[PDB]
Amino acid sequence: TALQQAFDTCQNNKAAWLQRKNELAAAEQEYLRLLSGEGRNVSRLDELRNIIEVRKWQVNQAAGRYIRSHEAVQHISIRDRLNDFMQQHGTALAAALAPELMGYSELTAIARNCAIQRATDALREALLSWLAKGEKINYSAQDSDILTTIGFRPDVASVDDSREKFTPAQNMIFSRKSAQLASRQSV
Amino acid sequence: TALQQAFDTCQNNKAAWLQRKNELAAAEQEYLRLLSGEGRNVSRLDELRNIIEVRKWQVNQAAGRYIRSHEAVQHISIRDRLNDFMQQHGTALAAALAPELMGYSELTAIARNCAIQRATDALREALLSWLAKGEKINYSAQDSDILTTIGFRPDVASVDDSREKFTPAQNMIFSRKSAQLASRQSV
Amino acid sequence: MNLTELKNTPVSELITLGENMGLENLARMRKQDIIFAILKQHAKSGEDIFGDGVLEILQDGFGFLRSADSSYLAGPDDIYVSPSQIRRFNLRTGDTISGKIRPPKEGERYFALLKVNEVNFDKPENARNKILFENLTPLHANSRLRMERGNGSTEDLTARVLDLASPIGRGQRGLIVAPPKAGKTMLLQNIAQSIAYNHPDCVLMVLLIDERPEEVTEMQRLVKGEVVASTFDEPASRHVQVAEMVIEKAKRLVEHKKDVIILLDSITRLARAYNTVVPASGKVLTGGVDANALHRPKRFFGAARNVEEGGSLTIIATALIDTGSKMDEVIYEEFKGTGNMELHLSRKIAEKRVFPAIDYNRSGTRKEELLTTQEELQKMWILRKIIHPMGEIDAMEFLINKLAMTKTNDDFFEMMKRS
Amino acid sequence: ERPEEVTEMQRLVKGEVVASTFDEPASRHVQVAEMVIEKAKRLVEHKKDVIILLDSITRLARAYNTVVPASGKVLTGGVDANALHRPKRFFGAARNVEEGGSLTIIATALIDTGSKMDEVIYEEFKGTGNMELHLSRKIAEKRVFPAIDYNRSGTRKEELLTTQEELQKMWILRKIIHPMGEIDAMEFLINKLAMTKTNDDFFEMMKRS
């Protein structure tokens, strides 16, 4: 159930990022309402800038962690599929690709590396030649709808937020800004 | 069954201290023989004095650990004999000391230790009244041999060599010196 | 069979292997070329060969690799690493690798690295997509580091004295300044052994530069963790290069969610070494030190940091005082105020054979409230309000002869509290 | 050194003495220096104690500086950058062997010579040796020989080399002689040592009073 709990955590932090984006949208809508109106006081404007800055940083890091979570769940699903598929049908692959397997099994490290490289480029030419037809392929039977919902390509609003980086000193600036922000909604 | 381990630990500590004193006395007699002779090599005398210091520190440490082991043996022996006696005559002790345990059974910690100190000093007058008779008592049934072979008090040779006190800096430097002494002895 | 185990063995094991294996004359040359020859004939014999060590990148794109117990020296024991290996495993300087070495071609001497079986103690595939330095960020020290063990010993007494004098936390920026013969060697000794014993989880690094080789070798056999020490036999270039590779590999280690504490001896020595190695900028200050020679030590000293998401980097460093060289004072008050906390020692205290020679009144710390709790907070405010009025050395003997009778520090707190 | 000094040293020594006067260029001196230290290392290789005298580090540093090719970098005073490497390597060879034997160097230094080379090779050699002994001229003018500076001199790790009681014996002697001036401590110590025959006699002199 490791895959299921990993996907559950991915959904959890994705929903957290969604709520953070809702709070964002609220912050910018009240910002535009105040600036379009009679915004005489600017101290409120300054604190609004504080929340907007910490908010964009927080949504950036939340989108980034969502991207890493999605990549991790995809990788663990791929590894599980590799494991059970090899346990099912490893003997046919062994018969078809025996020489480099003996090279990797009962030889020294450098022969193992040579076997790794030749099996690598053989399988890569296999994949690039057999995908020319490119017939549509479905997901795994046990994990079809989960991966269709999460999708191989995540939301477009994730990559644009994840690419925004900041200086590590500026990262502590954002961290202390978020600390005093949390103290702000504390009161 | 820890009495046997305490016993043979005390025995081997005593043997180690005895042999430490043996090589000590050997070192001083050899150094005195060198001093009596016309040996002009002052380096030999200096290193012999260093060896004398290392040996006396080692003997002091051995005597200290032997004293600690003897105290541990005495404590465990008296605790076991006391426990079996108090199991034998617990009802009579409770009858003769009823009010204190009446209080101890349900009262809080401060009252518990107040009853504890009342019981302890009352039994101090009881014991001092009893010992006015001053009768002679032998050792226990199966712990008599351990106490006899270990001895009543530690050997006087263990207290006329431990009366010197070394601050832990001296102990550390002497441990280092004994370390290179052991290195040379190995060579 | 790796190079590490036969390197760690003494010369006698190498000799005996030599007669057992055909090398009759191994008692003429240096250790490095002797192991080079024995590894050559090993590769001739076809015995399995393994490699372990840290890789760095020189001016060219090609990279070298060096061992740990070799005192971090580059020579015949280096290992080839191609730029392609750097690219495909996003490798960089300061990363440790445990990978099988390869029998060199004719015309090349070092054992080439076939590929990485692990990167920085972790698997290469997780290192390919791994946390970078930009996310690693400097936080204030929060977790107090314990240096008290309890044995009624003078080193324990010194540890307790420095605990009560100033708190030491994880990822802090601490400095020590002391006159000559003021007790630096044994203080660093007990702090190292105490952080090793109390905290086996955190890795122990002790840095020594231009030190006497004897102090180097008696630090080699004392500290449990690995210790780097380049004595004054090597030139200033070796000292400086060791400095950056060790600080940057410590940075790489703390990048792996790992607590690292490095002991530095001494910041003045590396400052002079940097002044020697850096080209003159044409703007020289008092003492023959130019402006660009101060930024690099400043960056080195400011590298001390704690990490919010996990890990800490504690640089604890020693500095020289009043040695008769004016540039020493120049860098002393050029580095002043740049650390999280400082430890001052004096001459007259150590003259009276009072150890340790720490100055309780002068030594201090910033932001003790966050690192400690309120009970202990007021429990050392009572300490310095009691100790500040009367004399410094008088308080020294008072604390040494009153703390000695108490086995721990808390019990000491209650025993003096009733007074 | 001057030929008279060489000939009085070679006449007043027991072991063999190596000596090159000034009448030959610096190449002679430098090559003698490295091959003598190398043969001393070769002899201590056999677990044989080696003790070598040296006078003075200033002259050998000057010889190495004037014999080494220029590295393109000039330090303070006028000494070359890698020139200081060789004297430092020669001086750093002193060590006590764990397996057996030892290599001890007793090398003197020249200071306040009216020049700049001595000081500029001096500052870096303050913390190199593990034992230092200072001299001064104010004591020497009025006949207090030796005109050493005991307060400014000493030996590190003095606890391991000697026994324990004489450790605090030296400590109490030092704390007795700290208040009054160093020169005053000097004639004090020479008169206290005048009537003594053996060191322990002096110890009991100074400790029973």
Ligand SMILES: Nc1ncnc2c1ncn2[C@@H]1O[C@H](COP(=O)(O)OP(=O)(O)OP(O)(O)=S)[C@@H](O)[C@H]1O
């Ligand atoms: N806790 C201690 N335990 C044992 N000896 C100590 C302790 N503290 C100080 N000492 C002694 O104090 C003296 C100072 O030794 P050093 O470490 O050489 O001083 P230093 O401050 O390191 O400067 P150097 O190295 O002598 S120039 C030595 O004789 C030590 O034995």
Ligand SMILES: [Mg+2]
């Ligand atoms: Mg020291």
